[PDB]
Amino acid sequence: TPPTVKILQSSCDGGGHFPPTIQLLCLVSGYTPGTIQITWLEDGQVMDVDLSTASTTQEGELASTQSELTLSQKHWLSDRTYTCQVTYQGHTFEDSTKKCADSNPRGVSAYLSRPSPFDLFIRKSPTITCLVVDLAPSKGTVQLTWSRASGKPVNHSTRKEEKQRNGTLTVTSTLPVGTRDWIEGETYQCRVTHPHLPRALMRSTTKTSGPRAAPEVYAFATPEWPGSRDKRTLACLIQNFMPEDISVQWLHNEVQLPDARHSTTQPRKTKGSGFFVFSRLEVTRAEWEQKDEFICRAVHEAASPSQTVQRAVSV
Amino acid sequence: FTPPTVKILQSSCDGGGHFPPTIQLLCLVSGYTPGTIQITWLEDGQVMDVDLSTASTTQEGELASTQSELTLSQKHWLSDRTYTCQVTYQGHTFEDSTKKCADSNPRGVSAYLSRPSPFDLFIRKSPTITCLVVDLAPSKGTVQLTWSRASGKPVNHSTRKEEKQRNGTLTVTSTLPVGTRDWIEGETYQCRVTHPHLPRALMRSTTKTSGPRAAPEVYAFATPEWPGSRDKRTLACLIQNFMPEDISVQWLHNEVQLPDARHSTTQPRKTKGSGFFVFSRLEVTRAEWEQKDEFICRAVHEAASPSQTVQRAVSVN
Amino acid sequence: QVQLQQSGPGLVKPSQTLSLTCGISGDSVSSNSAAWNWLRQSPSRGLEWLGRTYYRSKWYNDYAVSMKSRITINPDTSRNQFSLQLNSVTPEDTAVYYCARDGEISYDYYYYGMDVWGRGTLVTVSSASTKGPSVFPLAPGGTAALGCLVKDYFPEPVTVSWNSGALTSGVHTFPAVLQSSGLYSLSSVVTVPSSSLGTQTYICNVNHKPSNTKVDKKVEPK
Amino acid sequence: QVQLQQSGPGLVKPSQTLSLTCGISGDSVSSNSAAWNWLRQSPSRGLEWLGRTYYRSKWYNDYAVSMKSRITINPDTSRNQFSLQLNSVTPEDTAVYYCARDGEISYDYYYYGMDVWGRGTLVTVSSASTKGPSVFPLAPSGTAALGCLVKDYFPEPVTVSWNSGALTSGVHTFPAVLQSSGLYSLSSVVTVPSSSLGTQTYICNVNHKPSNTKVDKKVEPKSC
Amino acid sequence: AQSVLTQPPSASGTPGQRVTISCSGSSSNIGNNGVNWYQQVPGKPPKLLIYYDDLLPSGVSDRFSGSKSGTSASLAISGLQSEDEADYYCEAWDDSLDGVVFGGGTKLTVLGQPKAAPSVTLFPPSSEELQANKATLVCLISDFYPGAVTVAWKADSSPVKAGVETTTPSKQSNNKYAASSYLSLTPEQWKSHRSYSCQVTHEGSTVEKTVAPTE
Amino acid sequence: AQSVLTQPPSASGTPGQRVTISCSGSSSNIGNNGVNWYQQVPGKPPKLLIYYDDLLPSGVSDRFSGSKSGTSASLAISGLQSEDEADYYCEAWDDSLDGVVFGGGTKLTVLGQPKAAPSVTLFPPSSEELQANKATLVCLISDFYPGAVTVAWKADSSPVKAGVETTTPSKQSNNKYAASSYLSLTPEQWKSHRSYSCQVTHEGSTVEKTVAPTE
Ligand SMILES: *[C@@H]1O[C@H](CO)[C@@H](O[C@@H]2O[C@H](CO)[C@@H](O[C@@H]3O[C@H](CO[C@@H]4O[C@H](CO)[C@@H](O)[C@H](O)[C@@H]4O)[C@@H](O)[C@H](O[C@@H]4O[C@H](CO)[C@@H](O)[C@H](O)[C@@H]4O)[C@@H]3O)[C@H](O)[C@H]2NC(C)=O)[C@H](O)[C@H]1NC(C)=O
Ligand SMILES: *[C@@H]1O[C@H](CO)[C@@H](O[C@@H]2O[C@H](CO)[C@@H](O[C@@H]3O[C@H](CO[C@@H]4O[C@H](CO)[C@@H](O)[C@H](O)[C@@H]4O)[C@@H](O)[C@H](O[C@@H]4O[C@H](CO)[C@@H](O)[C@H](O)[C@@H]4O)[C@@H]3O)[C@H](O)[C@H]2NC(C)=O)[C@H](O)[C@H]1NC(C)=O
């Protein structure tokens, strides 16, 4: 018969805490005696023999060798693999051992954007971003791949892998999508593989399915409020559209204003059928007289004929 | 007469970090002068039958050592119980124990402490704060939650709810009544949570937001008809530039406060430069259209005056 | 995809214990973020939940309680399966048992639903010995139909294919019938419109599992 | 109530290696959601980050280039402390060295900053001898004032305390001075009313750490 | 005894209209937690439709809707079809039981479907089974609508009042029905008679099918 | 050679004004990540002031404000006080270096503080130290601001040339400066002269304290 190796380790206490030094023990058992050679490999490489020490017991036919390595709690917890390699009559036998893997770690999040109506319709260069957060802080391990429901090829992606300050890795790839293909069916699929994933992740995004309904606009102005002559606020209600994805901007002298100048809400639940948002702008003296008119524009899928709607308002 | 050392060793984990189908625990009593040495296996302090374990003594030279082995299914071990191995020698009792090791990087726990609503604190004059903890291991009676006051002044009687979640978590909430003046005049209220699973205790604090209090400015709306489409109308409210954020908002009808589920009200949102704002929408119905055409959108806020409220109304003329 | 496969005996004596195991593929029993349920359905008691097992930092179980005093669910993490064991059965414990996956969907998530199921398994509680079927094939302008007669067998799955299931066209396997002496009788029908009387040969495949009976009859006219 | 104690030699020879230790009270090295940093400050290079050690699912390290060639930071879970070892130092490695906790400020979180520091340790690179100070009393003849002269010591901390930490009122320890000779001299004065002259003696406690010198002198209202 | 969540045992429809199914419960289940719905087309396992009160997953039709207010919830099916006849089940997570809680079931019928006659197929006691001593008269009926079919077995012209048993009709996947009837027989009392008849009744009535040992 | 992030070396304010300090990076640090501000009163360890871009930690005065746009950030100390004299440091996390990156520092001076003249106290060689045959004179200079001083020593009516070494002045917890001068001597020379003098000149005007042998 051939012999058998098992490894045993120093164990954690009642409170399930490691001790300062992890002893690992090779037990080769159940063999014909004679030449027995034990090597220790750290991570797949040979070790300095000094802290590795062997011994052999026998009764009658039963014979068991044991080798013992000591590690510091630090080395063990550095995620190294420890291989015990047994040379017996010109053969090799193996057992390796690693720190035992976490039972309930968090765990990694992945998010897949839809492109914006602005991105689709106005400046016609849409894209989606697949973003993966809380990966282990080591690069080059991760594999992120794009693909289509239609089996048709994809454009080249762009990929950032950037170590976060809290000791995670955030890997993010954006994919240019065909401005047409997106509108006719076409599910895009994002796929990440990493050693620390039990399974590969996949997210997939597409045009939201439903009964397309155009947006309704209402522009506005506020009754002047005391003490501010020169500061006036303008409103836009936009309601009962579908699906929820909507872009919104404001135009002074027929020029788009910085998306930081106004604040839209997230399209929220209507009680009935549809979706709605609200956006405010805050204008002043200079804007008062340049010309006084203000555009509140919404780019929506069901918007027509040109995929936008704009309502004008003044004071 | 060396006092015997006792040490437990265990099946290790394979190359990929996975656990083996059984878990062996080997108790080792080494380095002793012979005699009676009695090994015993406790599970969480209880005894389990001697017919799950085997003993082997070996006397080499003058010294002596005994080894004893207990086998465990993976399930028992992953059930996180403490297993003690306890030897009796010369009337003394020695022991070593073991459970499975801690996750090196587990989730993780969230604790949310609310401030009381402007409604609650001004109108109902029964203001309360809530402490909430999610993602605790689903075992009741381990969590501990205590309220304090920075002044060390006595606190009211709180009311606790431990509730076991569908996703195999536990969520605990305690809510506290607060002295209705004490909130307004200073007063930090503290919420302290401890669990064995948590490395440090969790403290969450809550208090009146210090800042430059300014009142809200309300305006009432409604949308022009989109006629032939159904009935009724829709109306909304823009309430802005208030400080601090804490605000309650509601809609009445002839002094009848309409249920929260009727109106969709947004959360106070920042403005570039100074101030916050909310917007709230209510879709009316043709019955109340004619019944009385007036509708009121009220804002409770700290800095409103006199009553910490500002009302307003609108119809279709 | 994810997939669940039942297995176990379909006949239990009164006072004895039912055991049914459910192996899964496409996921892990030991997985966080999902949970593993046993359910049952009898026309009398409707659809009825029994238990759940799942792993986070430890193994946890949630039973129906209801009946927690007779039931054990507990996972075999090596074989990647989980098993239901119910003690001291009576006829009331006769049902079709289902194993099912309660886990999340995505995005917003936290939301659980049991979105994956096993075919179901028919467990019947009786003293009556398990008898195998006596099978008789019978003789068949518009069309023609022949079939096999599966007669007098105890507890019943009894499923039937045709020449290893190559002909799915116009095939009706009928439900069974209880006699005054309770035993089941079931019969099947396959159609071919005359046409090949001698070009096509028909062997009915009869499966009664709990009696270990596979005896397949070749049906011939006259 | 997190707190951080540095420890280690004040003086290190050229080409040898620096070793400093920060023990952590109130959190743990092994903590998820925090990270443990070394930085230092010369007047010359200003405030400069060296390295960081932290535990996610295993132990990780992050170092600055430049130091990367010469530096190691290791956690010790045993006593709950971490430490820095810098190889082959030159005089440019003279600096005050700071251990610090990078971490939470919770709520929204994800945002880290270094919210907790150790007081600093002065590490001086010289081929030259740690020398303990001669210490003389500075005698009195406003109200009154008396002193301690801590003379000719190397390298620098020299802390002083009056009557074993008892009297903190009106006491000023001055910065030191190097003579071109190369050693350091320093003085500490206390200001006391002469209404209190005759009811107690006063004692100056000087402790030069890396000479392991503690000795005390008494302040005498001199002849007659 | 009975279930925990309450739902009406019966609900009905017409092929174009919209019907809703009620689900009532406690705060321990519907009040503080969300609700799921399932569809069961029996002999098959349950299939998920709605989750956390509002949601539809992949592979599900948007004419299926759901709602929740307080301690109750409603499942709205609009624009029905034939395969829509099913047992429909609601469930929530009850956190005072630590457990999943179900509804009693609601059987959903759709009427306004045509009246289809049965198809009566009969066979003679086979080549075997005569050497087995006694034999059996087997009758297979299919593809009818209501599930109301009653049999009176007549050997020769004389009706058989003993030695007979019948099933209660069971659904088919195209939403027709299935029945079977059996008459136990001794070849002595077989070959001592001439002819046979099945004699079904579908509503008002249908006709039989007849065979004799004339091989 | 210098910091990765750039801040101006010095900044000036007059009490009650609003001073701002700037911090300029690249996108790998300030662009992509949040910026922190720390304040340092020398001899004490840095203290966190602003975290992420605009957030102030518990126990920080609201006079302290911060902002970030694009690749640079600003710290605004509004309504200056005297206790604000410090070194102000910015840092961010760098995702090309995987490392924390720092600003070179800005020393903030609060201008227009009252002119304060030094309090000089001077001590004679101790009962000891004369055995040991070396006599040292100690001049301690206490609270003075702008904070430049010049010291000459006097042997009788004459200037002392060597044996003298002097502190470069150091700021204290009241933000006024300290200093010291020492005179090395041979204990004969202590008796060889009638009196010895420390003269400190600060701005225009000189304080002098003086002592003599035996008493
Ligand atoms: C430690 O390390 C880093 C620090 O860099 C942290 O990183 C953050 O982790 C967050 C939590 O997972 C990430 O949150 C997500 O951000 C996503 C993308 O950002 C948005 O993209 C859309 C589309 O372009 C825009 O509209 C937005 O304005 C943003 O640009 C979100 O898509 C994502 O989804 C949301 O989740 C929220 C939860 O509150 C929902 O309410 C919401 O409906 C939606 O589902 C989510 O917010 C964050 O991006 C990420 N930041 C970076 C720079 O990577 C780690 O979390 C830290 N890890 C630990 C353990 O502390
Ligand atoms: C397992 O499943 C459990 C339960 O099924 C999950 O628990 C949920 O976790 C969420 C976050 O961890 C909880 O949401 C929070 O709710 C807090 C308090 O509840 C609100 O109270 C305020 C007024 O005080 C109202 O505005 C709300 O409508 C609620 O009534 C919030 O304070 C909290 O924080 C917020 O976050 C948002 C979004 O980022 C911010 O914009 C905002 O500034 C605010 O700080 C958050 O919304 C949820 O309640 C909780 N479920 C419970 C307690 O039943 C676990 O997450 C699941 N675990 C896993 C591992 O999947």
CSV table of C-alpha atoms in Angstrom, one decimal, chain E residues 29-163:
chain,number,residue,atom,x,y,z
E,29,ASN,CA,-46.9,39.3,8.6
E,30,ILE,CA,-48.4,41.6,6.0
E,31,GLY,CA,-48.1,44.8,8.0
E,32,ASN,CA,-44.4,44.8,8.7
E,33,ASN,CA,-43.3,42.7,5.7
E,34,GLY,CA,-43.9,42.2,2.0
E,35,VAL,CA,-46.2,39.7,0.1
E,36,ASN,CA,-45.6,37.1,-2.6
E,37,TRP,CA,-48.0,35.4,-5.1
E,38,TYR,CA,-47.8,32.1,-6.8
E,39,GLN,CA,-49.6,30.3,-9.6
E,40,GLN,CA,-50.3,26.5,-9.6
E,41,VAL,CA,-51.5,24.5,-12.5
E,42,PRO,CA,-51.7,21.2,-10.6
E,43,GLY,CA,-49.4,18.2,-11.0
E,44,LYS,CA,-46.9,21.0,-11.7
E,45,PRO,CA,-45.1,23.0,-9.0
E,46,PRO,CA,-45.9,26.6,-8.0
E,47,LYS,CA,-44.5,29.5,-10.1
E,48,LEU,CA,-43.7,32.9,-8.7
E,49,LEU,CA,-45.6,35.9,-10.0
E,50,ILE,CA,-45.4,38.9,-7.6
E,51,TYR,CA,-42.8,39.6,-4.9
E,52,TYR,CA,-42.7,42.3,-2.1
E,53,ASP,CA,-46.2,43.5,-2.9
E,54,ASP,CA,-45.4,45.3,-6.2
E,55,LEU,CA,-42.9,43.4,-8.2
E,56,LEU,CA,-42.8,41.3,-11.3
E,57,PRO,CA,-39.7,39.2,-12.2
E,58,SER,CA,-38.4,38.0,-15.5
E,59,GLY,CA,-40.7,35.8,-17.7
E,60,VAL,CA,-43.9,37.2,-16.2
E,61,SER,CA,-46.8,39.1,-17.8
E,62,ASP,CA,-47.5,42.7,-16.9
E,63,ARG,CA,-51.3,42.1,-16.8
E,64,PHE,CA,-50.4,40.5,-13.5
E,65,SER,CA,-50.3,43.2,-10.8
E,66,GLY,CA,-50.3,43.4,-7.0
E,67,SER,CA,-51.1,45.8,-4.2
E,68,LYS,CA,-50.9,46.1,-0.4
E,69,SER,CA,-52.6,48.3,2.2
E,70,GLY,CA,-52.1,47.7,5.9
E,71,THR,CA,-52.9,44.2,7.0
E,72,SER,CA,-54.3,43.2,3.5
E,73,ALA,CA,-53.2,42.7,-0.1
E,74,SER,CA,-54.6,42.2,-3.6
E,75,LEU,CA,-53.6,40.3,-6.8
E,76,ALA,CA,-55.0,41.8,-10.0
E,77,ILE,CA,-55.1,39.8,-13.2
E,78,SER,CA,-56.4,41.7,-16.3
E,79,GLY,CA,-57.2,40.6,-19.8
E,80,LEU,CA,-57.4,36.8,-18.9
E,81,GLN,CA,-56.9,33.7,-20.9
E,82,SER,CA,-57.5,29.9,-21.0
E,83,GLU,CA,-54.4,28.8,-19.1
E,84,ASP,CA,-55.2,31.4,-16.4
E,85,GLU,CA,-57.3,28.8,-14.6
E,86,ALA,CA,-55.2,28.0,-11.7
E,87,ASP,CA,-54.9,27.7,-7.9
E,88,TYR,CA,-53.5,31.0,-6.8
E,89,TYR,CA,-51.5,31.4,-3.5
E,90,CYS,CA,-50.4,34.3,-1.4
E,91,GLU,CA,-47.7,34.3,1.3
E,92,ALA,CA,-45.8,36.5,3.7
E,93,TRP,CA,-43.0,36.3,6.2
E,94,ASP,CA,-44.3,36.4,9.7
E,95,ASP,CA,-41.8,37.6,12.2
E,96,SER,CA,-43.8,36.7,15.4
E,97,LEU,CA,-43.7,33.1,14.2
E,98,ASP,CA,-40.2,33.2,12.6
E,99,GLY,CA,-41.7,31.6,9.6
E,100,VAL,CA,-43.3,31.6,6.2
E,101,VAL,CA,-47.1,31.9,6.2
E,102,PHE,CA,-49.4,30.9,3.3
E,103,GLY,CA,-52.9,31.6,2.1
E,104,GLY,CA,-55.7,29.0,2.0
E,105,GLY,CA,-55.7,29.0,-1.8
E,106,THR,CA,-58.0,30.6,-4.3
E,107,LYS,CA,-59.3,28.5,-7.2
E,108,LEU,CA,-59.7,30.7,-10.3
E,109,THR,CA,-62.3,29.6,-12.8
E,110,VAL,CA,-62.9,31.2,-16.3
E,111,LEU,CA,-66.3,30.7,-17.8
E,112,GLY,CA,-67.5,31.8,-21.2
E,113,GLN,CA,-65.7,28.8,-22.7
E,114,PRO,CA,-67.4,26.7,-25.4
E,115,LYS,CA,-69.2,23.4,-24.7
E,116,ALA,CA,-67.1,20.5,-26.1
E,117,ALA,CA,-68.5,17.0,-26.3
E,118,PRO,CA,-66.5,14.0,-24.9
E,119,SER,CA,-64.6,11.5,-26.9
E,120,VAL,CA,-65.4,7.9,-25.8
E,121,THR,CA,-62.8,5.3,-26.5
E,122,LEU,CA,-63.3,1.7,-25.5
E,123,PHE,CA,-61.1,-1.5,-25.6
E,124,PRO,CA,-61.8,-5.2,-25.2
E,125,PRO,CA,-60.1,-7.3,-22.5
E,126,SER,CA,-56.7,-7.8,-24.0
E,127,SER,CA,-54.7,-10.6,-25.5
E,128,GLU,CA,-53.3,-11.4,-22.1
E,129,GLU,CA,-55.4,-11.2,-18.9
E,130,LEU,CA,-57.8,-13.9,-20.1
E,131,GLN,CA,-55.1,-16.5,-19.3
E,132,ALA,CA,-54.8,-14.5,-16.0
E,133,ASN,CA,-58.4,-15.6,-15.3
E,134,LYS,CA,-60.6,-12.6,-15.0
E,135,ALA,CA,-60.6,-9.5,-17.1
E,136,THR,CA,-61.7,-5.8,-17.2
E,137,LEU,CA,-63.8,-3.4,-19.3
E,138,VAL,CA,-61.9,-0.1,-19.7
E,139,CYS,CA,-63.3,3.2,-20.8
E,140,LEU,CA,-61.4,6.4,-21.7
E,141,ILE,CA,-63.1,9.8,-22.1
E,142,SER,CA,-61.4,13.1,-22.9
E,143,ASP,CA,-61.5,16.7,-24.1
E,144,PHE,CA,-64.9,17.8,-22.6
E,145,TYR,CA,-65.6,21.1,-20.8
E,146,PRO,CA,-67.5,21.0,-17.5
E,147,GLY,CA,-66.3,18.0,-15.6
E,148,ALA,CA,-69.8,16.8,-15.3
E,149,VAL,CA,-69.9,13.3,-16.8
E,150,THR,CA,-71.9,10.4,-15.3
E,151,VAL,CA,-71.6,6.8,-16.4
E,152,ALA,CA,-74.0,3.9,-16.3
E,153,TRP,CA,-72.4,0.7,-17.6
E,154,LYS,CA,-74.7,-1.5,-19.7
E,155,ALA,CA,-73.6,-5.1,-20.5
E,156,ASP,CA,-75.8,-6.2,-23.4
E,157,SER,CA,-78.9,-4.1,-23.0
E,158,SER,CA,-78.9,-4.7,-19.2
E,159,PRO,CA,-77.3,-2.0,-16.9
E,160,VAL,CA,-74.6,-3.1,-14.5
E,161,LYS,CA,-75.3,-2.0,-10.9
E,162,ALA,CA,-72.3,-3.7,-9.3
E,163,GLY,CA,-68.7,-4.3,-10.2
